[PDB]
Design a protein around this ligand. Structure first.
Ligand code: TV2
Length: 207
């Protein structure tokens, strides 16, 4: 288990997301589904020139899995997945620019719902989650668990849980007052409103 500090701008973004009063929290789901769809586009594209990239699983899809016992909502995709270097360095590097632009736009009169336009939509998870665990597997790399409760740090470890083939699972440990996102009716409402034209099947598991 290695512990890392977020780069300063991402820590700042996460605190803004956690601290700002903003009632329209439901947009976290559209952002994470859009991230999954982007990951799925990438593996689909890559497989056109290299068919063996789909040996780790041919099906391209998204599952949404609520668990009231654990108070988690899990978004699973079989997209391209993330490497160790993604988790520790690259994602944070790419996001440094988008954070700055987003934070400047918010001063200009934009709102938190537009986070996705700046390539940092993942961090909207913290509108609803006290902790986020990300399990991910890229071809030719090992499976990793990334985890953060914000507070300026995150951890990465080699994951020895259930092997997943290829892709990413984002596990949102929901805040005590956000359990509405475990309800079938609520998730269905949100997917229909914001994520109706995603080009991959989205399966909403029932409890
Ligand atoms: N599902 C998924 N798949 C990816 C993905 C796949 C390949 C390359 C980059 C990627 N970035 C993100 C969005 C993201 C951003 C920061 C993160 C994160 C996911 O997980 C931990 O920190 N995601 N999210």
């Amino acid at each position: 288990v290695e512990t890392f500090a977020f780069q300063a701008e991402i820590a700042q973004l996460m605190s803004l997301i956690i601290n700002t009063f903003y009632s329209n929290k439901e947009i976290f789901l559209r952002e994470l589904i859009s991230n999954s769809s982007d990951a799925l586009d990438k593996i689909r594209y890559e497989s056109l020139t290299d068919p063996s990239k789909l040996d780790s699983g041919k099906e391209l899809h998204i599952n949404l899995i609520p668990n009231k016992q654990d108070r988690t909502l899990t978004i699973v995709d079989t997209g391209i997945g993330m490497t160790k270097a993604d988790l520790i360095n690259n994602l944070g590097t790419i996001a440094k620019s988008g954070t700055k632009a987003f934070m400047e736009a918010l001063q200009a009169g934009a709102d938190i719902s537009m986070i996705g336009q700046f390539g940092v939509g993942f961090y909207s998870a913290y509108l609803v989650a006290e902790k986020v665990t990300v399990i991910t597997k890229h071809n030719d790399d090992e499976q990793y668990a990334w985890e953060s409760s914000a507070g300026g740090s995150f951890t990465v470890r080699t994951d020895t849980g259930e092997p997943m083939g290829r892709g990413t699972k984002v596990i949102l440990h929901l805040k005590e007052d956000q359990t509405e996102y475990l309800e079938e009716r609520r998730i269905k409402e949100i997917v229909k409103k914001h994520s109706q034209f995603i080009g991959y099947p989205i399966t909403l598991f029932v409890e």
